[PDB]
Amino acid sequence: FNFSQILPDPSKPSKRSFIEDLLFNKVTLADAGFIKQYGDCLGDIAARDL
Amino acid sequence: LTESNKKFLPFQQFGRDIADTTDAVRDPQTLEILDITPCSFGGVSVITPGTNTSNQVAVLYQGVNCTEVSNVFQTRAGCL
Amino acid sequence: AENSVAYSNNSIAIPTNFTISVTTEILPVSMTKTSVDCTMYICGDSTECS
Numbered sequence A: 001f002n003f004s005q006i007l008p009d010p011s012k013p014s015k016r017s018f019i020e021d022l023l024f025n026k027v028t029l030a031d032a033g034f035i036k037q038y039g040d041c042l043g044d045i046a047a048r049d050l
Numbered sequence B: 001l002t003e004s005n006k007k008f009l010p011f012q013q014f015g016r017d018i019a020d021t022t023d024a025v026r027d028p029q030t031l032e033i034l035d036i037t038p039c040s041f042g043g044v045s046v047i048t049p050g051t052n053t054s055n056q057v058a059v060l061y062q063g064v065n066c067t068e069v070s071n072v073f074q075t076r077a078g079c080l
Numbered sequence C: 001a002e003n004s005v006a007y008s009n010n011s012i013a014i015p016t017n018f019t020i021s022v023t024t025e026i027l028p029v030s031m032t033k034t035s036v037d038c039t040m041y042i043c044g045d046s047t048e049c050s
């Protein structure tokens, strides 16, 4: 049996399998992606994030 | 009040936001466009052991960078 | 599709072969945790409103 696609891949920096990477890529996280720490919203442009 | 790159049309004075609040103004003496950004604010959390044990208290400023606030630590949840 | 099982009182149907099917099921677990500053949301920058 072959489990190379559900076992973790150490070449990735986050220890996630290929199918988990696909499942993370399909969902657009949209808001609350990474962190909106303060200082980042102190800089402003014409189009502002929700 | 910061300098902004929002090109106002010459008949416009105020530039507004999604929630119908002013976030861009035109200074009358010097015709430039200023961006308004509200001051730093956030929640305060108290991390403590029980008062049956001790009285030492840690304070977490949630979501705030540590430079804009002793044992100061960066947590990705707030300045500790 | 309309189907009729060929039922009979002395006849049976036995499989002679199989297959292995691996299906996908997706279940939500926990949503985004939020918090509301009530005073700043309601009034905002106004000590008299506070």
Ligand SMILES: *[C@@H]1O[C@H](CO)[C@@H](O[C@@H]2O[C@H](CO)[C@@H](O)[C@H](O)[C@H]2NC(C)=O)[C@H](O)[C@H]1NC(C)=O
Binding pocket: A002, A003, A004, A005
């Ligand atoms: C398990 O599956 C993976 C993914 O298909 C295999 O990895 C590669 O498979 C392709 C098949 O087209 C080969 O050309 C590559 O050489 C494989 N890469 C490596 C690093 O081996 C993997 O070989 C499979 N393992 C088994 C035991 O079948």
Ligand SMILES: *[C@@H]1O[C@H](CO)[C@@H](O)[C@H](O)[C@H]1NC(C)=O
Binding pocket: B028, B029, B030
């Ligand atoms: C007075 O206002 C005009 C525009 O209204 C401006 O061009 C001028 O520089 C101002 N003079 C000052 C600030 O001394």
Ligand SMILES: *[C@@H]1O[C@H](CO)[C@@H](O)[C@H](O)[C@H]1NC(C)=O
Binding pocket: C008, C009, C010
């Ligand atoms: C099923 O049983 C009935 C009544 O016992 C009979 O009339 C019928 O012929 C049987 N079916 C067959 C033998 O396929």
